Amino acid sequence: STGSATTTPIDSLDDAYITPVQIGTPAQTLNLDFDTGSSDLWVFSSETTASEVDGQTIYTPSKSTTAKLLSGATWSISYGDGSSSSGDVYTDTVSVGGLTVTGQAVESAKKVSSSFTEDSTIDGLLGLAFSTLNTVSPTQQKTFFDNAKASLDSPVFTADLGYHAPGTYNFGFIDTTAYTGSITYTAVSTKQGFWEWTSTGYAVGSGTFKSTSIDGIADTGTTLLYLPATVVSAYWAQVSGAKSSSSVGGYVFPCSATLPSFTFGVGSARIVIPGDYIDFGPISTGSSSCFGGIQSSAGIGINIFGDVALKAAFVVFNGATTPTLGFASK
Ligand SMILES: CCn1ccc(CN)c1
Numbered sequence: 001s002t003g004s005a006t007t008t009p010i011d012s013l014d015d016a017y018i019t020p021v022q023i024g025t026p027a028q029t030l031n032l033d034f035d036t037g038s039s040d041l042w043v044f045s046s047e048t049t050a051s052e053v054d055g056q057t058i059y060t061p062s063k064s065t066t067a068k069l070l071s072g073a074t075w076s077i078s079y080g081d082g083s084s085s086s087g088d089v090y091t092d093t094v095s096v097g098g099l100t101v102t103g104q105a106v107e108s109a110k111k112v113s114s115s116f117t118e119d120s121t122i123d124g125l126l127g128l129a130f131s132t133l134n135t136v137s138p139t140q141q142k143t144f145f146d147n148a149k150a151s152l153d154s155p156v157f158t159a160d161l162g163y164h165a166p167g168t169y170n171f172g173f174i175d176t177t178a179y180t181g182s183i184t185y186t187a188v189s190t191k192q193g194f195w196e197w198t199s200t201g202y203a204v205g206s207g208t209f210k211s212t213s214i215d216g217i218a219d220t221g222t223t224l225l226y227l228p229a230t231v232v233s234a235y236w237a238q239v240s241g242a243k244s245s246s247s248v249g250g251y252v253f254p255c256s257a258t259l260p261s262f263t264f265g266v267g268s269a270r271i272v273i274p275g276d277y278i279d280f281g282p283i284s285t286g287s288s289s290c291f292g293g294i295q296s297s298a299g300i301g302i303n304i305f306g307d308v309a310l311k312a313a314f315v316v317f318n319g320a321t322t323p324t325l326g327f328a329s330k
Helices: 144-151 230-234
Strands: 003-009 017-023 027-033 042-044 068-078 084-096 099-112 122-128 156-160 167-171 182-188 196-204 210-219 226-227 244-247 248-255 262-266 267-274 279-280 289-292 294-296 302-303 314-318 324-328
Touching: 027 042, 042 084, 068 099, 068 182, 099 144, 182 196, 196 230, 210 226, 230 248, 230 294, 248 294
Parallel strands: 027 122, 042 099, 210 302, 226 294
Antiparallel strands: 003 017, 003 167, 017 027, 017 084, 042 122, 068 084, 084 099, 156 167, 156 314, 182 324, 196 210, 196 262, 226 302, 244 248, 248 289, 262 267, 279 289, 314 324
8 A cells, every 4th residue: 555645834934744634434634743753643632621722623533433542541742842742542543645544543632732732733743753752651552654564565654845835745655756866775773763864974055075974863843954063053154144042042144144055965975955945034023033944953962854954855764674764855
């Protein structure tokens, strides 16, 4: 089997991407944030505290003839931005782009933090990291991809995120029309539960490529590119007036600037992020200070190849017995 679904930016900045997902019988379609940095499929629901729902579409398990309470199971997750959610668990039929999994754990939110409430466009998350990170207790649950994998034509999914435009998540096949050149594959460590890999270096604009190993994760659920402070300083030093602002929480730059590109290495191959992809717009409405899309990972503990980086590539998440990542230009 295969599946193919369009993923759409939630706003004009590509702050996140939503993909429609069918849950239950009859189908209830929710728009979920596909997140290769986490491993829980959770949804706003009829159980979510009413004051914490503000415009989201909810899953109502009592209206699904295939929903079953997973008795005793609870979940609770916290994310890198400090947001969080928790609740109980149903199993139900979940379909993405024509690919159907029966018995998928659908984690029903009883509580969500304010940042989720405030984002009316995201009805929940669909985790695509390794199932070892799934938070369901006392019986850990598998991701949608892990459950689908044996049925898939090939044990892979691909992310093709657009810049200010829709893109595609495919399951079970590699669309050879969706990228240019060849796909360069690189090793993955699953030791931390992430699609963790080592970039071979970087370049800023037209500058010379610096060969240096950068360990990080391919994370569709993180907006920006978070890299070591040395690398990020080298980038922003090429932008007149750019500075790190403690009050804003990262590098900002004059909105009048033209940003240089940023290149990252995948083995001997190179992915070029155009400068425009690094502009996240005014820090507040009407400001002439703009927020940068490349930020320091120093306070995180891990480097994150988030959407800013991934949207410049066609990305293969290869879930074979030994997982690997593939990157192609597009
Ligand atoms: C934009 C919604 N969101 C918040 C945290 C995550 C996971 N990185 C997704």
